[PDB]
Design an enzyme around this catalytic site. Structure first.
Site, short mmCIF file in Angstrom:
data_model
loop_
_atom_site.label_atom_id
_atom_site.label_comp_id
_atom_site.label_asym_id
_atom_site.label_seq_id
_atom_site.Cartn_x
_atom_site.Cartn_y
_atom_site.Cartn_z
CD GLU A 83 -6.97 1.33 -6.81
OE1 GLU A 83 -7.78 2.09 -6.24
OE2 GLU A 83 -5.74 1.57 -6.87
CD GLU A 127 -5.87 7.10 -8.85
OE1 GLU A 127 -5.88 6.28 -9.79
OE2 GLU A 127 -6.24 6.80 -7.70
CG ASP A 174 -13.03 5.71 -1.16
OD1 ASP A 174 -12.14 4.87 -1.41
OD2 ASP A 174 -13.55 5.83 -0.03
CE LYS A 203 -3.63 3.27 -9.00
NZ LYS A 203 -4.89 3.91 -8.53
N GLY A 220 0.79 -1.22 0.00
CA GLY A 220 0.00 0.00 0.00
C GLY A 220 0.83 1.27 0.00
CD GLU A 279 -6.77 7.63 -3.62
OE1 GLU A 279 -6.66 7.11 -4.74
OE2 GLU A 279 -6.02 7.35 -2.66
CE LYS A 317 -0.51 3.87 -5.13
NZ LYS A 317 -1.62 4.86 -5.04
N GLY A 333 -8.13 0.98 -3.08
CA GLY A 333 -6.87 0.74 -2.40
C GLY A 333 -6.96 0.83 -0.89
O1 LIG Z 1 -4.12 5.64 -3.75
C1 LIG Z 1 -4.36 4.46 -3.49
N1 LIG Z 1 -4.73 3.58 -4.41
O2 LIG Z 1 -5.04 4.03 -5.69
C2 LIG Z 1 -4.25 3.96 -2.08
O3 LIG Z 1 -5.45 4.24 -1.37
C3 LIG Z 1 -3.03 4.62 -1.39
O4 LIG Z 1 -1.87 4.40 -2.20
C4 LIG Z 1 -2.80 4.06 0.01
O5 LIG Z 1 -2.36 2.71 -0.08
MG LIG Z 2 -4.88 6.49 -5.87
#
Ligand SMILES: O=C(NO)[C@H](O)[C@H](O)CO
Ligand SMILES: [Mg+2]
Ligand SMILES: O=C(NO)[C@H](O)[C@H](O)CO
Ligand SMILES: [Mg+2]
Lengths: 434, 434
Positions: free
Chosen positions: A381, A273, A323, A217, A21, A300, A219, A352
């Site tokens: 997601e 995002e 969300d 996806k 995460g 989100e 990060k 997430g």
């Molecule tokens: O942004 C997110 N997923 O898209 C998650 O909520 C965030 O990275 C925390 O794990």
């Molecule tokens: Mg996100």
């Protein structure tokens, strides 16, 4: 039958141990749930479940906020609650003193949203239907009766919402059949957590594609060199046909965001995002203008339907996330989905967090059936974490969400999981903290 | 010296008994304070005081949010805290897990803001200066070091803030003398609470003008006929020269707001405050475009500096309110004041709540001295309630705020008041609830 108690639990999972995460803004989240149960004096089956998703510290505050709603809900008639979910929601959102703590944003609003979601779970359970069908099978009149149209008359009126819902009625049944047989498109973020090594990123990216996901996806946002290296490695691992989105988790300012994406565009980006603050509507629009046609999304952390209205009005997004636990429950997400449909903007639900896949799948499915009739152009997601703690865990088949069948919002958690991970006296935490 | 404890109290005052503070959105607020004390092992005088203002229900949740910050602050070196208020603030605002509960909005952010404000109170006390002088006498470098410039590079950079502060240095001392001798303009809202009878409105409006206030404010927004009647009565009572503002407390949608004001303009309106949702930047701009030149304002519920940036960028306001307890403490309000100065938009501080007059006066005064050098073109809101509960109550003379002299943020409350009004075990509440 009456609601006899509002039970709350501070449940936290040690996801930070393996950095599951992790992202540019949240380097070590501990996925947590401010779990709530609306108990009734009816059958054991008759209860509503819900939760607010947080990432560790502060979950006790979030839990206390939910607990503070007991006065408003305990003693209410179950029949009356499930027959007028709009009135139930308004009892909480229109409490002017609770509004002061927001209004309609932050801890107090998410707490209200969890109790509202638990009420919808209760309603669906009473109707013996999975939430997506409960929602999609309500009449257009029943649906608009649950929505708060304040601050939206310039973008979505009750009559306009009714028109959209009525236009979909003829195809509701057919769409229901299609969803049940084909499932709903999904994409996975599990391969891209920022704390993972390059080796792990590549291994998981390959497993994701092998599992049928057509989109993944990654990060990004902490270091541009790391992002360039990781995006190149991931693109090489998945091939040229798989979609690859990136997520900055609000790290950048307007100018820097545009410059940063200029360095990642060569890797074929599905969308970026949250390039900046979740409150910067004008900023997202400026970023979008600078990096177009690279798609921009956010959602989100969008606090309520009023901010979503502006994101759409300003043309700040190419697609939005919704969300299940960030806003005022189902009632608010219905308004958001209708706004998105009216403005012709695709919705890619965020999931997430613990229980979010379980919850949000119902909103996306209800949208397909009763609002847009569009799902192959979008995706929900998915993250491969903590589903074992839910009685009705999501099921993915060949990169697609299978439609839930059991009654409810899929929020019910195993009592054994609550006993093990309740903070700080749960079995796991008492020993871990020791 | 070290911070040895973070003490919190849920204090509520029965202002609803006489409907003091009542408006179109909040018909019966009970002015409350989530009071916090940063205790040290130094002199009894060495402590920091702060509070989050709420209107009753939910104050226990707000208090719990403040209490949850003890882990971050207890044990810190006092010398280190007061020497780097930016670092102190960042320890809280940059806690990614606490950010999830916002980010920078709602209950968790206001809790953080109260602890930050208490730290500034501690710093001012250590310097033996009233907060306004403490702030105004810091070097430009020290001031910008406390500000969070993230999400503002497109509107206010560190270098730009430094330029504004350096431009004011030559006149700082002279401005300080001017403020000490003349006081700061004030306006009163106490005559206009919506729950008051027409007779009471008129009586208080007259007393306000007799007391020297050059501006008064009336609550509007629930019923247009009531508003037309009340505005006519108030205007007749105060005469043609006194300024009369109106406040809708977020009640209207865009279209309705424009139509509503069309019916009140004939009474010479100083400004209409919060015509719509505090999150609708585009909406306020649309309303402003429709009712211009009738001035539009908003700000008491504006969640953070990022939203303020947009209000200014979009030209959604003619003037703004700032609030001492709504945002991330002094650090955030300094950014907001600099943004307002750079965009040439007047600031009329909000103070409708317990302790707010005591707190916000310092920010307005610091702005006059170190930022704008402008006060005769604006005013600080004043309400005639609950000042008796503070050790350093605000002093009004001929409709103007006298500059505080004692060290601190004027947040310290009488222990006797806390013992009497703590909820629900305080002396007053135990008997009232019984
Ligand atoms: O942004 C997110 N997923 O898209 C998650 O909520 C965030 O990275 C925390 O794990
Ligand atoms: Mg996100
Ligand atoms: O808006 C206000 N004063 O301007 C007050 O905070 C509000 O009316 C609650 O009393
Ligand atoms: Mg106001």
């Amino acid at each position: 039958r009456t609601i006899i108690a509002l039970e709350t639990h501070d449940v936290r999972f040690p996801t930070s141990r393996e950095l599951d995460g992790s992202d540019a803004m949240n380097p070590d989240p501990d996925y947590s749930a401010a779990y709530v149960v609306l108990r009734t004096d009816g059958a054991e089956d008759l209860a509503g479940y819900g939760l607010v998703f947080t990432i560790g510290r502060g979950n006790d505050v979030q839990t206390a906020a939910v607990a503070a709603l007991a006065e408003h809900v305990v003693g209410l008639s179950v029949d009356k609650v499930i027959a007028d979910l709009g009135a139930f929601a308004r009892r909480l959102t229109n409490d002017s003193q609770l509004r002061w703590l927001g209004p309609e944003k932050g801890v107090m609003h998410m707490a209200i949203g969890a109790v509202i979601n638990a009420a919808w779970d209760l309603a669906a359970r009473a109707a013996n239907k999975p939430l997506w069908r409960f929602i999609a099978e309500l009449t257009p009149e029943q649906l608009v009766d649950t929505i708060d149209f304040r601050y939206l008359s310039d973008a979505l009126t009750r009559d306009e919402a009714l028109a959209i819902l009525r236009d979909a009625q003829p195809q509701r049944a057919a769409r229901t059949a299609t969803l049940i047989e084909q499932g709903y498109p999904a994409y996975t973020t599990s391969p891209g957590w920022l704390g993972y090594s390059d080796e792990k990123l590549v291994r998981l990216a390959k497993e994701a594609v092998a599992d049928g996901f057509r989109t993944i996806k990654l990060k990004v946002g902490a270091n541009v060199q790391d992002d360039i290296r990781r995006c190149r490695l991931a693109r090489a691992a998945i091939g040229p046909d798989i979609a690859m989105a990136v997520d900055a988790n609000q790290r950048w300012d307007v100018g820097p965001a545009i410059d940063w994406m200029r360095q990642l565009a060569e890797f074929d980006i599905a969308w970026i995002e949250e390039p900046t603050s979740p409150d910067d509507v004008l900023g997202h629009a400026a970023i979008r203008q600078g990096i177009t046609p690279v798609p921009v999304s956010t959602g989100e952390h969008t606090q309520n339907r009023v901010v979503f209205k502006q994101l759409l009005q300003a043309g700040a997004v190419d697609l939005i996330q919704i969300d299940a636990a960030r806003v005022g429950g189902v009632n608010e997400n219905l308004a958001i989905l209708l706004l998105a449909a009216k403005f012709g903007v695709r919705v890619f639900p965020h999931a997430g967090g613990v229980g979010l896949c379980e919850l949000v799948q119902h909103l996306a499915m209800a949208d397909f059936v009763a609002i847009t009739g569009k799902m192959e152009d979008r995706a929900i997601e998915f993250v491969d974490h903590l589903h074992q703690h839910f009685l009705d865990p999501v099921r993915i088949q060949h990169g697609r969400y299978l439609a839930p069948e059991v009654p409810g919002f899929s929020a019910e958690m195993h009592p054994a999981s609550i006993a093990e991970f309740s903070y700080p006296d749960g079995r796991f935490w008492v020993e871990d903290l020791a």
